[PDB]
């Protein structure tokens, strides 16, 4: 990229569907290496919504600038859970008067962590961030207590966030393996029609990713009985 030194990989902005872009950012995360984090930028008639933020303030300005530079007013940001791979750019967007959204639970968990909260918050299993266009859904505790997914109804796309772990559940300290199968069950129950499922840390797949995550969630409940 355009810098002066070694290389943590640059932010990626790739067009998924007609009004849906994927964004990938990368962070050193001890016990793992470079971790990729996928989010979405959803478009409505000249307005952009960040589904999750990049890891850092730095890539968040990057992502916002790209779309502002192509004619889009950044109309808001939804964080899918309180971990910094979804929330790490909330402070930047707050200082720029861009509405940041998170679930009431995400904001209290942000609070207990001493992190900056999203400015708006929603309470309840549902929340239309933009009615008939972006839907927030709470399948239940899993990756974290507060993790949510974001559904686009005219594209049948499902940002699963870190709740979707097709090939292994990953970091487990803040997780609820006992509740995760039930949420993964109820998630596929509602969004079986997912044409595309964008997870946080694995590449975009399809409806089976709901099936793959379900069966990985129940596999961790199995491994619970180790002694
Ligand atoms: Zn997480
Ligand atoms: Zn994550
Ligand atoms: Zn990727």
Element layout with pairings:
Blueprint: E1 12-17, E2 20-28, E3 34-44, E4 47-51, H1 57-68, E5 73-79, H2 84-87, H3 90-95, E6 100-103, H4 104-112, E7 120-122, E8 126-130, E9 134-137, E10 149-152, E11 157-161, H5 180-191, E12 196-199, H6 208-222
Parallel strand pairs: 4-5, 5-6, 6-7, 11-12
Antiparallel strand pairs: 1-2, 2-3, 3-4, 8-9, 9-10, 10-11
Helix pairs in contact: 5-6
The chain binds zinc ion (3 copies).
One zinc ion (ZN) is lined by residues 83, 85, 162, 200-201.
Class based on secondary structure composition and strand pairing? alpha/beta
- The CATH fourth-level homologous superfamily: Ribonuclease Z/Hydroxyacylglutathione hydrolase-like
The number of helices is 6
Gross morphology is: globular
Largest sheet: 7 strands, mixed
Q: In what range is the share of β-strand residues?
A: 25-35%
Biggest sheet: strands side by side, in what order?
1-2-3-4-5-6-7
Distance between the termini: 50 Å
Rg, Cα atoms, Å: 17 Å
Query: What's the CATH architecture?
Result: 4-Layer Sandwich
Number of strands: 12
Q: What are the distinct ligands in this entry?
A: zinc ion
Share of helix, binned: 25-40%
EC number: 3.1.26.-, 3.5.2.6
GO biological process, one term: response to antibiotic
Subunit structure: Monomer.
Protein name: Metallo-beta-lactamase IMP-1
């Amino acid at each position: 990229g355009p810098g002066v030194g070694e290389s943590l990989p640059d932010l990626k902005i790739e067009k998924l569907d007609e009004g849906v872009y994927v964004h990938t950012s990368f962070e050193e995360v001890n016990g793992w290496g470079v971790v990729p984090k996928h989010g979405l930028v959803v478009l409505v008639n000249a307005e952009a919504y960040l589904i999750d933020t990049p890891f850092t303030a730095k890539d968040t300005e990057k992502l916002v600038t790209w779309f502002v530079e192509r004619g889009y007013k950044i109309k808001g940001s939804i964080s899918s859970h309180f971990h910094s791979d979804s929330t790490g750019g909330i402070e930047w967007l707050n200082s720029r008067s861009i509405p940041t959204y998170a679930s009431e639970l995400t904001n209290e968990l942000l609070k207990k962590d001493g992190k900056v909260q999203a400015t708006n918050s929603f309470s309840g299993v549902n929340y239309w961030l933009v009615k008939n266009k972006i839907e927030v859904f709470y399948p239940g505790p899993g990756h974290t207590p507060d993790n949510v997914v974001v559904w686009l109804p005219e594209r049948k796309i499902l940002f699963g966030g870190c709740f979707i772990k097709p090939y292994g559940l990953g970091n487990l300290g803040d997780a609820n393996i006992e509740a995760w199968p039930k949420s993964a069950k109820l998630l596929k129950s509602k969004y079986g029609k997912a044409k595309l499922v964008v997870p946080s840390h694995s590449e975009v797949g399809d409806a089976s990713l709901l099936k793959l995550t379900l069966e990985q969630a129940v596999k961790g409940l199995n491994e619970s009985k180790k002694p």
